[PDB]
Symmetry: C3
């Protein structure tokens, strides 16, 4: 043929730079000077030319004693408060614990390694003061850095300089789900973080160092219930993410139910339904006892239907003794702002309850439950049911049920529900300087974020860099200081919720994440410079 063709059946195998990799594990220096746990790891070796893929391992201890206890899912990531990689010239790269987690949110393997098992995350119960609740375990946390992007090409080079990796830890309270029965006071005193930093080191023969570009995240958290947040000195940004976080400071961080390892939306709902059912349908000899005076427990008629206002509940239990009767708690949990206002009753959220009474165990075994319980219901702190805004008692459960409530202090919760299902941003407005950069009603920016990144856990994100990661200077939003366009102001309009619904009182915090472009220069030690 006359035409010149490109070879698609063969390739010239290039000889690469002569190097040798090695997995290096290092023990750190623990410091507790708010008495926050800080681990410092010093990397200095004449043969370690470059490094990447930082993995922090943590030896979790044996948990002995009484009460309910369980670690948060992906415990290893939740342990980290802040990570900082510095040199003699200063901080090269740094991240907030939540942002590291957010970057690793789609890496299923990294999340599994950090601690995601029935052994770690299911809520285990200790019976004797020497009973083992949790056996000792080791978790591996992948510290994803921009030095991993293109493996050897993106690796952090060491120009005979001392690289220091500083890991700040969140209090153990954050990574633990426990009940009142558990002796947390002793546990918090005795618990110590046992870390070990691992990395892939490279010994390079005649390394030809060239300058590079690195993306670094920056978050700004707005004031409690303020729908505005501003990121200053925005000169070269690659992306801008916007999300909400719930503030549970006004509460005691206690919740009725938790599903454990099983983390699906249905799992959260089923756990809640199970916890309520114990007090919702009662088989007792005469009127049930051990409930507040405020509680309205009605006997189920021969018809099987109990009418709570317009809501009808069908309750039918088999093998009930002749001396006993079937009862229904018509106001298990209720909320109202006024005496002549809408009432949010959890008992009204049930339509059908069927089961069989066990004479052997003296308890009701529920077969089928027809309800309208949602993720939000499972995400309401117990404090909000008994808040000052409520004209009613609120929590009409038994003392036995209330004692089973669990403290959840997970630092990385988003939205207003445990699954971040409910979208509470009705409108988004992003301003560069004073002019509107972007505005939306629907979460189309989140839809694109989820689509482009092939993620199911996305955020309302504005991407400015669609340029390949390999051999390219990232495309950034250019600033105009003279025109005043040197800042990014975000304003949201929260979705209007009913005042008589307890979720309305969940304090919100707007989080704005900005990824800034920096230049890496290895001339006279490792140093990073902000692009301006």
């Amino acid at each position: 043929d006359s035409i010149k063709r490109s070879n698609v059946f063969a390739v010239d195998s290039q000889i690469p730079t002569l190097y040798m990799p090695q997995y290096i594990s290092l023990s750190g220096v623990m410091t507790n000077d708010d008495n926050q746990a800080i681990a410092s790891f010093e990397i200095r070796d004449q043969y370690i030319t470059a490094l990447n893929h930082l993995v922090l391992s943590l030896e979790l201890p044996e948990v002995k004693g009484m009460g309910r206890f369980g670690y948060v899912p992906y415990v290893g990531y939740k342990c980290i408060n802040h990570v900082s990689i510095s040199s003699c010239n200063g901080v090269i790269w740094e991240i907030e614990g939540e942002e590291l987690y957010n970057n690793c949110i789609n890496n299923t393997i990294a999340l599994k390694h950090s601690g995601y098992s029935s052994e770690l995350n299911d809520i285990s119960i200790g019976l004797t003061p020497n009973d083992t609740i949790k056996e000792p375990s080791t978790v591996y946390v992948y510290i994803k850095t921009p030095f991993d992007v293109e493996d050897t090409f993106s690796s952090l080079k060491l120009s005979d300089s001392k690289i220091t990796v500083t890991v700040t830890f969140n209090p153990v309270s954050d990574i633990v789900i426990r009940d009142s029965s558990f002796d947390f006071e002793t546990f918090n005193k005795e618990f110590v973080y046992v870390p070990e930093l691992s990395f892939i080191g490279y010994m390079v023969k005649n390394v030809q160092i060239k300058p590079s570009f690195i993306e670094k995240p920056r978050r700004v958290i707005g004031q409690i219930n303020q729908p505005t947040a501003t990121v200053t000195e925005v000169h070269a940004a690659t992306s801008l993410s916007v999300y909400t976080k719930p503030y549970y400071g006004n509460t005691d961080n206690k919740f009725i139910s938790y599903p454990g390892y099983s983390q699906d939306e249905k799992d959260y709902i089923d756990a809640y339904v199970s916890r309520l059912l114990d007090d919702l349908v009662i088989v007792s000899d005469g009127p049930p006892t051990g409930y507040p005076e405020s509680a309205e427990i009605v006997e189920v008629p021969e018809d099987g239907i109990v009418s709570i206002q317009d809501a009808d509940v069908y309750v039918k239990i088999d093998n009930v003794p002749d001396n006993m009767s079937v009862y229904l708690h018509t106001n298990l949990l209720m909320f109202g702002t006024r005496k002549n206002s809408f009432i949010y009753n959890i008992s009204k959220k049930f339509s059908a309850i069927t089961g069989t009474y066990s004479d052997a165990t003296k308890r009701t075994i529920f077969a089928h439950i027809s309800h309208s319980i949602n993720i939000i219901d499972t995400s309401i702190p117990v404090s909000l049911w008994t808040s000052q805004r409520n004209v009613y008692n609120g929590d009409n459960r038994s003392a036995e049920s209330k004692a089973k409530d669990l403290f959840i202090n997970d630092p990385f919760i988003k939205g207003i529900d445990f699954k971040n299902k409910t979208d509470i941003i009705s409108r988004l407005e992003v301003r560069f300087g004073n002019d509107v950069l972007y505005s939306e009603n629907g979460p189309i920016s989140r839809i694109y974020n989820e689509l482009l990144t092939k993620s199911n856990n996305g955020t309302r994100t504005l991407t400015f860099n669609f340029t390949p990661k390999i051999a390219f200077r990232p495309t950034t939003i250019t600033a105009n200081v003279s025109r005043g366009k040197d800042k990014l102001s975000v304003r949201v309009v929260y979705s209007t919720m009913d005042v008589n619904h307890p979720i309305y009182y969940v304090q919100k915090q707007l989080v704005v994440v900005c990824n800034d472009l920096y230049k890496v220069s290895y001339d006279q030690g490792v140093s990073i410079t902000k692009i301006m």
Copy 2:
């Protein structure tokens, strides 16, 4: 130190080496992206919903990643209702992207779905939730069946393949995106009780097209190559289909589709959101069980004269011809007896020949009678029910070919039947499990291009595309996309090699089985190569 002594000595020069520890950061073309959302123009020209979106801006240099949002309304009233899974994709009948020079790219709704079938995120966004897909029941004429929702449909185009590089460029031209919608009947699963007549009248498609626009400073446009699908649907029950004017094809896909025109599109059961094979079967078993095993005081009533309900003997075994059914129910009242419907659903072509009985498909039924609810709670069911059984339209049980009554269920059960009009069903079953092609033959003109017995072309399709929902596909292009000109099957018009003729050999099915009467349609998809030239407006030319 930290590095091992064996490593240090191994390294610690003359040969030229490629730098693997650093890279030259190239300065890219100066551009700025922006997510742009546009409201369209609704047209009803029979009376097909057509949305037109006009894109014309001097600063929108290029665009890609088309996302069509749809506002689903609040569904109020009585009866059973639910949307089909991935409702957003099923909503689309045809998509066309055109310019002043004509159509640039166009796709059939099913082919867009087929291209997005492996994108789990895109399928979730289009409408895949218990809130949307489970069959909800309305009790009062003002009861809310379904709350309003917004779905997002990703219109995957060849302009997304290599992001900015593959993007559709606008040479100061008007780009028009035309979306033709399928009737709402297709995207809805409802019963007779539901007022569909009022719903069909009141329902309107509310769309909004979104895309990633790019403002490029001094754009250097170069010509490109685009692959465009083209389907041919063969005649009802015919095992042949031919694609004409095949000059430069990159691939050829072959699959089967059922035709339910001869039926009223009604089916006994539907699993809702839970879409697994077992879910479909369990739903069917659950729907049948209500009439299959009856606890009654004397012989059961409310069943046709044709029904043969036999009392279960002390041994527990009821013999329906060769088939033995073991039925044992606990807590049965002394005044009542356990009964078994021995011919719940039956089919036969001749007066005393072979019979396909659904009751014979059960071997063991165990449970406990509830005195409180006056109903039987089934514990364990041993059966041989398959996906095909759940995919048989009710019409075929009561067809003229059947010598028997067919549907011997209660009127209560029959009233619970659901209309399913999903436009993207493949094969002869709801899960496309049953492979009905015993042999495939592809002819380029008069000569055999490819032939197979097993679905090895589907195995390669699934393997190469990392898909679990593949088709018998012949790929001709194994060359990297965008970077090169795609490898195509070259035509020979003179010899008569300007057409692809597909011939299949369907599996031979039993005449006494209702699935035999399910009309089939062979679908052949051809991906043709086209050249994109941006000289004096955007234009595409077929490679010949």
Copy 3:
């Protein structure tokens, strides 16, 4: 419309075009899926299939797929195929030419390379139809319907599609597939007639590949990675790979050896392959004999069995362990009984006992008068994956001072033979990590040493796998585009071998898992050069 802040932001330096690309005309070729029938040769009477590829138009090939026609299984008894049956069928694969072997792999190593390809594993046979244990009632009853399984033979010629393809310089390429005995791929009970099945069963293979007809092919030399395994002596914590000159990676894992047993196990979960599924299947199998509702003391159990009646209290005390048993709808003439020593193990007559009945804390259910059996509602136990992985032989071994298997004859008849060739660790799920320390020596000097499985963590991380091994990677350089980075050897210094030493964690001698034999497996990936000058040939880099 574009926003005013964007237009003003944009409206001399050399820029790379990111919005357009020059469409290169590729090498003129035509692909074709080619399927070939082989030559079956039984000459240990191992099934060997040979496929000869020689055609003037087949210039190059890649993506080898082995089809396998599984027959209809008729008769009586319990039968089921192993998960990913197609991969388990293969014992060895060899691709050779007139110059010799180009590339070869062990069946387990091919499986290990394809372990993360979900599609390839599904194609090989992963269904409820194939993997659940079906039961045949009549001698003419169909246990399993005939099926076709597709096995993807992943070769280094698939890495960069057309670029990495195996070129044929007018040479005869022979693909040789050695099969494992059908015993390995089958889970059956004693009731099943395996003797007749093993005689009648024949491997029906067909090799498929993507052939390419290239016009004026410009062949250039390439680099290939080839695996090599070394299996250590039974229970030996050391293994050595000789002639290591240019290795890209080194994997280390453990395998159980069930030669000292009859390969029979109490339970198997079928298609459902999760850890919980394995445990639940075991609990279900034990429960039949664990809690008995009988009129007077239960019968049909060995003299050695200690079946105690459950008191009004509901608690039965087996030494320190307390079992709460409460069953509803029990007839007045009948009583609730608990087998206090269903399975037990001890090395000394009056010492520590490992009792499976002690592993249960609560058992609740309801007696069915209609079916005359107990339907269990909730079971609170401490049963683990190891328990489900103990062969029945070890419960009744000579080491045991007790009888061991105190189950009913009915339960014992339900035991299944499992001969899966690709089991790792000491449990069916390879959950239990038994390596306490790993030591790798290149020559006589320590190359790498670790306590924790940080090499496995990196393996799982870098390869995006959930089924990883303690692996040492030496090549972090891009595949095909570059010559792979390898460990360089020094023959003169004796640095030409990789010696692996492990420290296994020791189990309790009174636990039946201690008597499960281990085997250390060391995999070495060596670099080879492919030269197509005067036929296809591979040369080891030294």
